[PDB]
Amino acid sequence: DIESSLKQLAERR
Amino acid sequence: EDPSLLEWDADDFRIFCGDLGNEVNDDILARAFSRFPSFLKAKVIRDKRTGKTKGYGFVSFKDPSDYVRAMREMNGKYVGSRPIKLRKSMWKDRNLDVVRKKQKEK
């Protein structure tokens, strides 16, 4: 859910 | 005179369908199926030789109770570009004006 999107955003920043 | 109600005298339940958009519900104003005859013998009145609708349009349902229930359930519901409401029709020609004058001051 939101965990995957949050991890994706974090990995790029 | 206006020979218009001759095609709508059916002792039905007539309501005022107006304050809508000029083009909103131009031809499908009676397409709704809230009752059996929908707005039977009813359409949207317009200003002739101008391509524009003058607001109020005919809304006549042949079933009184069904008309009341639909109007209560669909008062101001989303209708095209301008959600319009329903209210009781006037149907007050001079045959009503004479009786009103007789019964008012006497």
Binding site: - | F13, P64, S65, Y67, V68, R69
Partner: protein, 42 residues
């Protein structure tokens, strides 16, 4: 057998209010739909 019980005063007031409102609504629905004109409100 088929027997009843007592009621409540607050329930009595709620029932009276709801019954008056329902009677008014039923009269309005029956006489305003277009089947029989209602009398003048007195």
């Amino acid at each position: 057998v088929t027997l009843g019980v007592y009621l409540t005063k607050k329930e009595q007031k709620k029932l009276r209010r709801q019954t008056r409102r329902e009677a008014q609504k039923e009269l309005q629905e029956k006489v305003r739909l277009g089947l029989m004109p209602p009398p003048e409100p007195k």
